[PDB]
Design an enzyme around this catalytic site. Sequence first.
Site, PDB file in Angstrom:
ATOM      1  N   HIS A   1       3.144  17.302 108.039  1.00 22.23           N
ATOM      2  CA  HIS A   1       2.489  16.070 108.475  1.00 22.23           C
ATOM      3  C   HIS A   1       1.021  16.022 108.069  1.00 22.23           C
ATOM      4  CE1 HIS A   1       1.649  18.360 112.442  1.00 22.23           C
ATOM      5  NE2 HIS A   1       0.475  18.186 111.862  1.00 22.23           N
TER       6      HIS A   1
ATOM      7  N   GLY B   1      -6.487  19.878 116.120  1.00 19.70           N
ATOM      8  CA  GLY B   1      -6.848  20.737 115.014  1.00 19.70           C
ATOM      9  C   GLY B   1      -6.131  22.064 114.972  1.00 19.70           C
TER      10      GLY B   1
ATOM     11  N   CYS C   1      -2.865  22.516 114.681  1.00 16.62           N
ATOM     12  CA  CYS C   1      -1.635  22.482 113.903  1.00 16.62           C
ATOM     13  C   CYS C   1      -1.687  23.501 112.774  1.00 16.62           C
ATOM     14  CB  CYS C   1      -1.416  21.079 113.347  1.00 16.62           C
ATOM     15  SG  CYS C   1      -1.212  19.894 114.643  1.00 16.62           S
TER      16      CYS C   1
END
Lengths: 300, 300
Positions: free
Chosen positions: B41, B143, B145
């Site tokens: 993503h 942040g 991820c």
Amino acid sequence: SGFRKMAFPSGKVEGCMVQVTCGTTTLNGLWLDDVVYCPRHVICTSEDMLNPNYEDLLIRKSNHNFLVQAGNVQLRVIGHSMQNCVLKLRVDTANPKTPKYKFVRIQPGQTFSVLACYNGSPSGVYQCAMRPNFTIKGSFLNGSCGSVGFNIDYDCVSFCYMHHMELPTGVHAGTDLEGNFYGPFVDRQTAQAAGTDTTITVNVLAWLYAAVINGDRWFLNRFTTTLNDFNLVAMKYNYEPLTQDHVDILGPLSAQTGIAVLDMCASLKELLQNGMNGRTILGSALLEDEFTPFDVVRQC
Amino acid sequence: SGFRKMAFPSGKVEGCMVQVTCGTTTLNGLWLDDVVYCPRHVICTSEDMLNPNYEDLLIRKSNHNFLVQAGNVQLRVIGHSMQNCVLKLRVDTANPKTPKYKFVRIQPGQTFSVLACYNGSPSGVYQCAMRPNFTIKGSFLNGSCGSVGFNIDYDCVSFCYMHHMELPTGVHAGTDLEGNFYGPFVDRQTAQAAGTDTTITVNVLAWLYAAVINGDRWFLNRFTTTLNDFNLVAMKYNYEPLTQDHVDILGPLSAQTGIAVLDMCASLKELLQNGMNGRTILGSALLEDEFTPFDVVRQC
């Protein structure tokens, strides 16, 4: 979101851990520049531990009586000195992975990360707080002596704890990295026991703020209290006194949540008086006191 | 002695964390050999997230649309591929600190260490369990991820989790390192929610054994129970069924303590039926289920 008891990344410290052997005793040492730091009781036999005179015991040792192993590479000891309850072993090689570091002594109520090691090999990392009675509730087995506790700031490792011993209650005692014990403990076999402990009130309040930041609000109330009136109920439940400095330190958390410090104190007072009633806060069924205000701001 | 929720030392993983930017989105990547792994993503805009076709979105990107930063050194992307919900970015430099590693998918009920990072920089390390409903109760901010979960065996890092998203209850969902989600979650904006969770019974029993190994014995009783009779009371309190495999796995802990598994089960049954009565076990006022039998043997 979420709130976890979170340690600092340990890589910078893992690269400093070595094995130190003297006689039949093996434990962990901390290798920084050309010095290896370890508990001085490494030079002791079980008979010595009953009543050791470390000055006498050490003057009887040679540089070659200390085997230092950094993974495979053995470190040549080229000198030794005692600094309080820590031994300093000068070696002929400076650790090429020495981080930027400081030796800092911490206060009861502050937290640090522990890198538990055995035979110079790191095993796990976890967070602890220095208890008001100057013990830590760690997890240490035989061979863990010399494991260190630390905080990280930017790129700088602040070492604050070296592990030395277990007390009869299963709690742990050690020194700062200058060799000075936390609390009234000594590195010899005595009847020494941890004194009575108290709960770190400012930390409990910080953790209640963490809960609010994470959407856990059931314990809140519209009531308030005075600092004095809070501290009368605090004492009764074996909580440390709350000071205006503690209120000021909780300022940012008060601002972020919109809940005044003495408002949170009123919630804590009710939690102490009524209990939790089968409910939890941030996954716990008791009031957690091993998160500092800094820890909360850092994680939230 | 002592018992702590303890993570693996994170150094081997810290050396693999990099920053990956695509457009205005920045997150974390895992750099192993000449490949960087990150959530797919990263290529998405907030508008794409509503209903993305990742095959379409990725065919529209070039190698130069991906900025990879390993500390200071920027990594030249020389190719890219999608593997399920993970993006694989081939870079022109093999990570010189690549540990021996494996990609392993874990089971609900097993634990792992999470290295939470931001902008490619590690922030903290903590232990988690994969919940029966395939979420984890982590601590993750915007942040995070691309942060990974792992176990260490000897010198080998077994990566088992990459972080992708937060669910409305504040719990977390992600993939194995082959890009396959844990649980019925997807990397797009939907009404998806965690299903109902249960307690990991075998872990609770392991943790009760940890307590006995540490001198906490107040919850023990002389009674026993059958596996069937235990599991009727387990179901009633939202506990997973206990199997003969679970009894066999608890064998070593049963042997070390001299307490039969179904004897411990009788203690757990009474704890479920009477509660804890203001007492604690290993410092907790609730029954802890995020320590596996292995975790207990390792720490004890």
